[PDB]
A paper describes a structure:
[name] (family 1 of the [name] superfamily) is the most prevalent form of [name] and removes uracil bases, regardless of their state of base pairing or sequence context, via the cleavage of the glycosyl bond attaching them to the deoxyribose. [name] inhibitors (which are interchangeably referred to herein as UngIns) are DNA mimetic proteins utilising charge-based alignment with the [name] DNA binding cleft to dock [name]. Docking promotes the hydrophobic sequestration of the sidechain of the apical residue in the [name] DNA minor groove binding loop, which is essentially irreversible under biological conditions, to inhibit [name]. UngIn protein structures described to date fall into one of three observed folds: Ugi/SAUGI (note that Ugi and SAUGI share the same protein fold at ~12% sequence residue identity), p56, and Vpr; yet, within each fold, type there is pronounced sequence plasticity, to the extent that the unambiguous identification of an [name] inhibitor in any genome is rarely straightforward.
The sequences MCUGI1, MCUGI2, MBUGI, SYUGI, and JMUGI were biochemically validated to act as UngIns; the sequence MCUGI1 was also structurally validated to act as an UngIn by co-crystallisation with [name]. The structural conservation between SAUGI and MCUGI1 variants is observed to be close with RMSD = 1.005 Å at low levels of sequence identity (29%). SAUGI contains 17 acidic residues, while MCUGI1 has 18 acidic residues. Just five such positions of negative charge are common to both sequences, of which, three are located within a 10-residue span in the [name]-binding β-strand 1 and α-helix 2. Of eight residues comprising the [name] binding β-strand, 24ECESIEEI31 in SAUGI and 24LTEFVQLG31 in MCUGI1, only a single glutamic acid residue is common to these variants and five residues comprise non-conservative variation. The [name]-sequestering hydrophobic pocket of SAUGI is formed by six residues, of which, only three are identical in MCUGI1. The other three residues forming the hydrophobic pocket in MCUGI1 do not align either at the sequence or structure level with those forming the hydrophobic pocket in the prototypical SAUGI, although residue side chains do occupy the same position in space. The surface negative charge distribution of MCUGI1 is somewhat different to that in Ugi, Ugi-2, and SAUGI. However, common properties among all these four Ugi/SAUGI variants include an invariant glutamic acid residue, a conserved acidic motif, and a spatially conserved hydrophobic pocket.
Author numbering:
A (entry chain B): 2 to 15, 21 to 61, 66 to 117
B (entry chain A): 1 to 215
């Protein structure tokens, strides 16, 4: 609920939500420009997509029980607010979501 | 051949007693989905010699009034989850028909074995029942269908499904395979994949009646 609430409050202002869980090849996600982080290549990752039937979808990815992705979708267009490779954050916009890295090591 | 013979082989090849005793405690000391009676609803409604098509899901829906024993299906009254909304958009494009019911019981009747790879889950806990022996069970089910059926379509959505290609004798059987119909994946090529028509082209081609996907 910690990261879920924040990520949802934010996207609204720029109502409630349920959670769909799916395992995906890292590859299945829309990287677009970005090479897939080396330490993630060929990973099966747990994804939690938040939704309701007023509808745009937010989500969180994880791998070996560590948050690795946070993003939203709008058809073909995914954006990542957060990309981590297990070892280090490569991209962050958590400040938008009023979240720290330490809000992630602690949930 | 009947599921009960196949189930007998699998349950004698491996010792699911530890799993059975476990799920007994779970169902009497937890809220587990689906209903104990519906764990095999897929096998119930798609008898072994009626399998034309196999669609793998992963995990049963962990929410209330969702899971009833078929991959992707929620109870009639329930509301559409994402993967399933997208499955219907692609069906609308591929085949033409627009399904209103998020219940896939009629697909089961029509010969689509809607098999999740794990068949139980605790309410709210997303991967609660991984690694209790279900995956072994469902692996032997994909194997069994490959082994004792002659011409069957396997639709494999997302990488986890596609790890099951090594169970499927594609000398004997078809494999239609794409990224998962999750909104996160759907646009890296599930949309436009047209697996419903493809499945039927293949079935028509081995002199089998095609799947009616619609209501």
């Amino acid at each position: 609920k910690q990261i879920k609430a924040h990520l949802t409050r934010y996207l609204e202002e720029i109502q409630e939500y349920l959670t769909e869980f799916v395992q995906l090849g890292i590859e299945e996600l829309a990287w677009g420009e970005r090479k897939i982080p080396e330490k993630l290549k060929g990973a099966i990752i747990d994804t939690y997509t938040f939704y309701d039937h007023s509808l745009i979808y937010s989500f969180i990815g994880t791998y070996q029980g560590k948050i690795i992705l946070v993003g939203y979708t709008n058809g073909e267009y995914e954006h990542f607010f957060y990309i981590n490779d297990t070892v280090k954050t490569l991209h962050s916009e958590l400040h938008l979501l009023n979240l720290t890295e330490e809000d992630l090591e602690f949930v | 051949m009947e599921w009960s013979q196949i189930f007998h082989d699998i349950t004698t090849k491996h010792d699911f007693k530890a799993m059975h005793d476990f799920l007994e405690k779970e169902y009497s000391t937890a809220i587990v989905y689906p209903d104990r009676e519906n764990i095999y609803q897929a096998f119930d409604l798609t008898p072994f010699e009626n399998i034309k098509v196999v669609i793998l899901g992963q995990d049963p829906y962990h929410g209330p009034n969702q899971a009833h024993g078929l991959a992707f299906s929620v109870q009639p009254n329930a509301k559409f989850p994402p993967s399933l909304r997208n499955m219907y958009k692609e069906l609308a494009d591929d085949i033409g028909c627009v399904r209103q019911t998020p219940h896939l019981q009629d697909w089961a009747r029509e010969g689509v074995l809607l098999l999740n790879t794990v068949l139980t889950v605790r309410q709210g806990e997303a991967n609660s029942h991984r690694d209790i022996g279900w995956e072994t069970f469902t692996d032997e089910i994909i194997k069994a269908v490959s082994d004792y059926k002659e011409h069957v379509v396997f639709i494999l959505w997302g990488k986890p499904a596609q790890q099951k290609i090594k169970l499927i004798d594609t000398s004997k059987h078809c494999i239609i395979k794409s990224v998962h119909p999750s909104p996160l994946s759907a646009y890296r090529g599930f949309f436009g994949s047209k697996p419903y028509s493809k499945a039927n082209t293949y079935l028509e081609s081995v002199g089998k009646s095609p799947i009616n996907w619609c209501e």
